[PDB]
């Protein structure tokens, strides 16, 4: 009676239990109550269009074949009782590769109350698809979804609901946010009905709204482009005669523009359209190429081969370009930074 009291109870519940059958098969849906405690929103891979999430996926349903009367109201059992009873086969619709953690013992728990209410919490690391639209890259915001539902049981057999209020059913941990470049604004849940070839299922949708931070692309791509187009714009301030001094201002700036375009394109998946960074790079490339062809136009108009401390003179094209180029680039910068920063 010291230990066999609970043993006899656990033998009484598991006797006559067909684990292949859902509770209330030909009588009622098996109401399943679900909530997610997100411990750590992991890193988001832009290249693979996927994100990683670490959860404490909780489920709760009502099996009346597990009722008991005894000295303890709630039986907290280990993982071995979970394999010997019915469990819902919930799978993630947009999941790519999710690993249930087994160190040191399968991260599961099972709590059976005396009225038949169960609670089956699993710890999962889910890699899910996040379809991205990188048209306003990098000043873009995504809504990464997480769709889960039953695989074998239709709408008439198993339905899903949130065990708390839907605003407070997906809880994100405070210190746990492994996001590097994005920023988690907030969660958003949804419950719909999907229709497939095998039948009609119940799907639960959770959207995570992410906003990309701008500091890395400003400090790595935008500001080097601004500095090199400023560097190509000081070409007009030198002497008209110094052709070998001013040809490197064309050549090296064009080479840095091309390799900056390559380095900026090599940090994002190979999409078929052009981002806002591509438009900024193209306009800056047009400016540095315009500087080079203006110098070529000056060199065509440059007579003689000496310098006056003698009528080589400063070019009027040069004098107009010194005012025309940085003002036009500032106008483009104002238009570009006012168009995309308020969307």
């Amino acid at each position, epitope marked *: 009676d010291n230990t066999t009291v609970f043993t006899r109870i656990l033998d009484r519940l598991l006797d006559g239990y067909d684990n292949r059958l859902r509770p209330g098969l030909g009588e009622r849906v098996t109401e399943v109550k679900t909530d997610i405690f997100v411990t750590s929103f992991g890193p988001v891979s832009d290249h693979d269009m996927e994100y990683t999430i670490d959860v404490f996926f909780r489920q709760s349903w009502k099996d009346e074949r597990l009722k008991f009367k005894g000295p303890m109201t709630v039986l907290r059992l280990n993982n071995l009782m979970a394999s010997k009873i019915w469990t819902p086969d919930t799978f993630f619709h947009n999941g790519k590769k999710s690993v249930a953690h087994n160190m040191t013992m399968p991260n599961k728990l099972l709590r059976i109350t005396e009225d038949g*209410t169960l609670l089956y919490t699993m710890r999962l690391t889910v890699r899910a698809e996040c379809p991205m639209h990188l048209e306003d890259f990098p000043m873009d915001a995504h809504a990464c979804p997480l769709k889960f539902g039953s695989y074998a049981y239709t709408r008439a057999e198993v*339905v899903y609901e949130w065990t708390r*209020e*839907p605003a407070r059913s997906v809880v994100v941990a405070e210190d746990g946010s492994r996001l590097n470049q994005y920023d988690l604004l907030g969660q*958003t849940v949804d*419950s719909g009905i999907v229709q497939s070839s095998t039948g009609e299922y119940v799907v639960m949708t959770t959207h995570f709204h992410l906003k990309r931070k701008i500091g890395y692309f400003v400090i790595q791509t935008y500001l080097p482009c601004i500095m090199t187009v400023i560097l190509s714009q000081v070409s007009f301030w030198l002497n008209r005669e110094s052709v070998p001094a001013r040809t490197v201002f064309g050549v090296t700036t064009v080479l840095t523009m091309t390799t900056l375009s390559i380095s900026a394109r090599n940090s994002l998946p190979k999409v078929a359209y052009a981002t806002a960074m591509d438009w900024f790079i193209a306009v800056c490339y047009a400016f540095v190429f315009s500087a080079l062809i203006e110098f070529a136009t000056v060199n065509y108009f440059t007579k003689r081969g000496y310098a006056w401390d003698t009528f080589n003179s400063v070019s009027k094209i040069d004098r107009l370009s010194r005012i025309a180029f940085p003002l036009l680039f500032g106008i483009f910068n104002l238009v570009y930074w006012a168009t995309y920063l308020n969307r």
Partner: antibody
Amino acid sequence: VQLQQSGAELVKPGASVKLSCTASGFNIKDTYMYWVKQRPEQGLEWIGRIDPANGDTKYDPKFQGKATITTDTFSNTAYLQLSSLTSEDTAVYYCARKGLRWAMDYWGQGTSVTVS
Amino acid sequence: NIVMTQSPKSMSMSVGERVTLSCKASEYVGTYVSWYQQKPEQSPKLLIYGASNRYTGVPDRFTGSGSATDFTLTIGSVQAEDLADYHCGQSYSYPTFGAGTKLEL
């Protein structure tokens, strides 16, 4: 699936009244229970929520202190208490059951409270 | 909290034509909006749940239509027993309701 309550009550202002909501055909502890207030010729407003399995209750931010909700599984009846009753507190009080997709499927017959 | 604006307030038709009742919210309450009717001296009865999911015992004329914020109940070919006070309420958070719409002849 049948919800029953008390009758109509009239009290002086500043008094206290306890009203009840009993149920049949189901156990209360599986689902939530909702209390709402229906003012005459007006809209509906939600008073509070009670979870009978956990004993967890919470209320509208306009209705703390003067409205508390208690549950009793053994009598199969959910209780609501009103304190510091005012002249504007006259309404009809409905008792609601949480149902499918949070819809308030079954509603009580309503108890009309009045002042004098 | 979450406010539920119900429009229009009071308008009356004849018998046998379509009508639409609009419901709006301050933030996202997506497919968690319940519609009820209020006969005089009667308890409220659930018409549709979710966004567009017909309850048992509800005729085919009542049809909802849902979105993130905007919701619409459509009653096509109304009758003389369909007059009530129609209430729109959300349940994405702690629940709220609207003012109610009146149907007369």
